[PDB]
């Protein structure tokens, strides 16, 4: 029954400056559960088509390193014991891509991370010539 | 203006109230700026005070005191080389190299062979 | 005849929980991790400082919430907030346990330069996986 | 009390007059149907902190609502 | 060629390294003055948080009586021992 | 020609402010402060008064130990520096009456003003 | 002595406002949660740890907050802030011929209480010359100039920045290292006349 | 209160190093510069030879954390084997799994 009257609704202001236009937002997820990364990247780009934008999706492969290490404690070399580090990789490219939606989507998702996640963003955005060339 | 201080601390204390949300939580720790900024520039401050690329690299300005020829111009070319391409430390840092390279071999000026 | 974080099988009087009872070689195939950090991944680095950091914690933690817990911890570390789970007992009093809460708390903040959080599961007797 | 029930929820601060506001609330609600004033408090029982229960009793009472009296005494208990 | 060596030379004036020519032993200043040695390095700077601050903290918040370390216990229990036995 | 979307500015916190307003209050929950399990889950108004007035003194035991021992907290291990979490310093220095009278209105206190008139 | 409440399950109704009961990302809490889910390896003549000392599942990533409800609720909400693109960029050529000069930065996001990490410094930029030096010998010059930097293939050349630590440095080194190019290949000397 | 008195002398080593790294790379650039006086490479070398002890980032090593074992120690986690294989079994840490491929 308790609804509220007024959202208190945040103040925006559109600067002289104009945006910038990034060009391709391709981001790239690593992890360990590949349940995990399948389920963010279905909430990323579940978020992006409804914000309105393109979208791709694709599974760069799995790295793994491992490294030997003794079994025992003093004297035992042929009984060893080994580990590895499963990384796995999703990518997310978007096209034509405002400034602004940028902002606004990169601070959802960077807000919405996991904890056992990485992730590198690369930006590319076309601007003009320079006035001195 | 310190006594509207002590007004407006008094003021803020009848204001705050317990919170009842998680976003308000992360209102609050943005609010004192320990949350990060997104998105991460990796650079929210240290700025190098403003420093400037050609701050950096050009050393022509800080290389005077010695002829364009000599022993100690290629040493000193080849430090600030090594300067300029090495962005880690800042002007600052590059200066006192400098000038504990110049307090050297004028304390050592005894040869210029 | 490997010794490894594993309980020896007794008469069957030793009530154990899942991860003390399964092996370590089932983390990732019947287990999941205590932590939960990137350090490891490739290209991040400070993993050194995560670990040592963490079992300071669980260290730390355990000692000043001694006798009520009955399980090894969950971390959670999204970007700089930190996450801590845990699951104990109610034998104290809900003020000490709010107290120490409270304490733990901002110890963890003033040291680590980094916003903390802390949750706690109660339980009134410690769940058993097996009797072994 | 609709009238005066953005952020002007700050100014009850203390627990003592939140707690004054809130029971001379649901007493008003109580002795004003009341399954929307049933409907309000069991929305807002978890959020919300004996006077109180004893009008909810007079005003079940003079309301005939006999099945939920049973309810809001095992929530008190 | 002469041409590419100007060439070269015009490249270095322009992305920074030298122009004039310069031995390997030379271009150790260089190398040796862009790459930051090892003795400054965080890696060998923070090789662990100190025990000190550890050990002195964990100490001096025993005494406040917090944080009953079943460790010191033993020990001191062991210690009573030894000294009521001599 | 070309047209350009206009750039704008936002505060740190006017975007939460409105992933807020975006959600109402949670509905038959206690507030954030209090934890979630039932057994924790304080009951009455005398004992939640008495529980969150404990936490506040667990935070003011904090300040003690922290103002008490700053020199454990020193290390500015966050690449931000905060002076909220930095350790607090209410220490008087050497005799200097120039300095001590700046520092008069720093301290915050009756003892040195006491003094520093004399 | 102390006695805990029920949980929240027999109290929380099918109708339900999860994005308002879950705002944010938080533990999975069963007692709060009313659903049975399990998790665990089950034994034999057995079945997996009940929710109630399942342990595991807070081990791993938590998923309830931000549930379909939620991201549209939550989509809807910040669409009122979200821009829109220019029409007229709709294609690679088009784009490219608006604005030529391509930039791209990145870095790394990871958790952890400090957040600078070297990466952040290093950018890269590409323009093709094709439509861009509308000449010959300075054209001729450059690709002379340039050693490895240029792809006759897709006909683009590409430079990286990583000189400097900051990534604004880095632009306007690279900006007033393409201006003095462009300028110092405008011209030329009487041994390279020679050739 | 580190582990022991040779942790100890390990941080003091790396102590003095840290705290004349930069002009220990000056004066050894100074004196592998090939095209400089030899007289001044030789200087230099008396001054690096003048220089205290324990100053070099040669005499430090790489040794554990906790239990101060010098070998079996990887650069990465700065742990030695014994307690890298102790928390892998207990789960300690995050996302490594035993290979067993
Ligand atoms: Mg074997």
């Known amino acids: 029954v308790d609804v509220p009257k007024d959202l208190t609704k945040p103040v925006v202001t559109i600067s002289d400056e104009p945006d910038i236009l990034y060009k391709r937002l391709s981001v790239l997820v690593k992890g360990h559960d590949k349940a995990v990364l399948d389920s963010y990247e279905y909430f990323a780009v579940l978020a992006a088509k409804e914000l309105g934008i393109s979208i791709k999706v694709h599974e760069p492969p799995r790295k793994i390193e491992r490294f030997t290490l003794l079994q025992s404690v003093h004297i035992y070399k042929k009984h060893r014991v080994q580990y590895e580090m499963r990384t796995l990789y999703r990518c997310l490219e978007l096209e034509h891509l405002t400034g602004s939606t940028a902002d606004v989507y990169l601070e959802y998702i960077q807000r919405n991370l996991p904890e056992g996640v990485a992730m590198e963003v690369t930006k590319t955005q076309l601007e003009q010539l320079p006035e001195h060339i | ?113 | 005849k490997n010794r490894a974080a594993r309980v020896r099988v007794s008469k069957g009087d030793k009530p154990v929980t899942y991860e003390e009872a399964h092996a370590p070689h089932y983390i990732a195939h019947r287990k999941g991790w205590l932590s939960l950090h990137t350090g490891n991944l490739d290209g991040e680095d400070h993993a050194a400082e995560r670990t040592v950091e963490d079992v300071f914690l669980r260290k730390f933690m355990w000692g000043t919430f001694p006798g009520c817990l009955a399980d090894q911890l969950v971390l959670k570390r999204r970007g700089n907030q930190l996450e801590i789970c845990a699951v104990v007992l109610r034998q104290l009093s809900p003020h000490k346990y709010y107290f120490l809460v409270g304490y733990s708390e901002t110890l963890l903040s003033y040291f680590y330069k980094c916003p903390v959080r802390l949750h706690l599961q109660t339980v009134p007797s410690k769940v058993v996986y097996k009797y072994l | 009390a609709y009238q005066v029930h953005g952020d002007n929820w700050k100014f009850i601060g203390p627990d003592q007059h939140r707690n004054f506001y809130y029971s001379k609330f649901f007493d008003l609600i109580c002795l004003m149907q009341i399954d929307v004033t049933l409907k309000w408090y069991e929305d807002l029982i978890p959020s919300a902190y004996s006077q109180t229960m004893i009008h909810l009793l007079q005003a079940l009472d003079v309301a005939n609502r006999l099945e939920v009296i049973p309810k809001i005494w095992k929530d008190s208990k | 060629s002469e041409y590419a060596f100007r060439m070269s030379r015009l490249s270095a004036r322009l992305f920074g390294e030298v122009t004039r020519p310069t031995n390997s032993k030379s271009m150790k200043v260089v190398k040796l003055f862009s790459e930051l040695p090892l003795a400054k390095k965080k890696e060998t700077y923070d090789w662990y948080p100190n025990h000190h601050t550890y050990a002195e903290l964990m100490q001096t918040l025993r005494f406040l009586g917090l944080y009953r370390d079943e460790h010191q216990d033993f020990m001191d229990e062991q210690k009573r021992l030894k000294k009521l036995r001599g | 020609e070309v047209v350009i979307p206009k750039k704008k500015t936002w505060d740190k916190v006017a975007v939460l402010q409105a992933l807020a307003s975006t959600v109402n209050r949670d509905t038959t929950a206690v507030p954030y402060v209090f934890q979630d399990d039932p057994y924790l889950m304080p009951a009455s108004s005398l004992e939640s008064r008495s529980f969150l007035l404990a936490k506040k003194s667990g935070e003011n035991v904090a300040k003690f130990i922290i103002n008490s021992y700053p020199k454990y907290f020193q290390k500015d291990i966050a690449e931000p520096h905060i002076p909220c979490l930095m350790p607090e310093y209410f220490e008087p220095q050497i005799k200097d009456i120039s300095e001590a009278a700046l520092k008069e209105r720093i301290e915050l206190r009756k003892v040195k003003a006491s003094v520093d008139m004399f | 002595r102390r006695k805990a409440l029920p949980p929240r399950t027999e109290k929380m109704a099918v109708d339900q406002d999860w994005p308002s009961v879950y705002p944010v990302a938080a533990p999975f809490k069963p007692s709060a949660v009313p659903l049975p889910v399990r998790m665990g390896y089950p034994v034999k003549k057995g079945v997996p740890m009940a929710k109630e000392g399942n342990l595991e599942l807070l081990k791993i990533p938590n998923f309830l907050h931000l549930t379909p409800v939620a991201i549209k609720k939550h989509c809807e909400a910040l669409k009122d802030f979200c821009t829109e693109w220019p029409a007229a960029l709709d294609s690679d050529e088009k784009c490219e011929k608006h604005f030529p000069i391509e930039i791209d930065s990145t870095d790394y996001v990871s958790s952890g209480p400090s957040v600078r990490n070297p990466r952040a410094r290093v950018v890269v930029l590409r323009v093709k010359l094709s439509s861009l030096n509308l000449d010959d010998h300075a054209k001729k010059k450059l690709i002379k100039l340039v050693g490895e930097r240029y792809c006759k293939t897709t006909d683009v050349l590409t430079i990286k920045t990583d000189r400097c630590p900051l990534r604004r440095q880095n632009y306007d080194y690279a900006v007033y290292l393409l201006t003095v190019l462009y300028h110092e290949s405008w011209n030329t000397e009487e041994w390279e006349k020679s050739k | 209160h580190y582990v022991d008195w040779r942790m100890w002398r390990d941080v003091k080593r790396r102590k003095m190093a840290y705290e004349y790294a930069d002009e220990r790379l000056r004066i050894n650039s100074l004196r592998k510069n090939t095209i400089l006086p030899k007289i001044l490479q030789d200087v230099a070398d008396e001054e690096i030879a003048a220089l205290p002890r324990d100053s070099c980032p040669v005499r430090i090593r790489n040794r554990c954390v906790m239990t101060s074992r010098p070998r079996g120690v990887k650069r990465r986690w700065r742990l030695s084997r014994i307690v890298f294989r102790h928390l892998a079994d207990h789960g300690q840490l995050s996302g490594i799994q035993r290979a067993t491929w």
């Open chain 2, 1 to 113: 203006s310190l006594w509207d201080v002590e007004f407006a601390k008094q003021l803020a204390t009848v204001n705050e109230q317990p919170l009842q949300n998680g976003f308000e939580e992360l209102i609050q720790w943005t609010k004192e700026g320990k949350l990060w900024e997104f998105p991460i520039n990796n650079e929210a401050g240290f700025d190098d005070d403003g420093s400037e690329f050609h701050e950096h690299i050009f050393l022509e300005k800080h290389l005077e005191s010695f002829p364009k020829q000599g022993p100690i111009r290629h040493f000193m070319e080849l430090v600030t080389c090594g300067l300029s391409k090495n962005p880690y430390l800042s002007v600052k840092q590059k200066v006192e190299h400098i000038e504990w390279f110049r307090n050297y071999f004028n304390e050592k000026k005894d040869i210029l062979k």
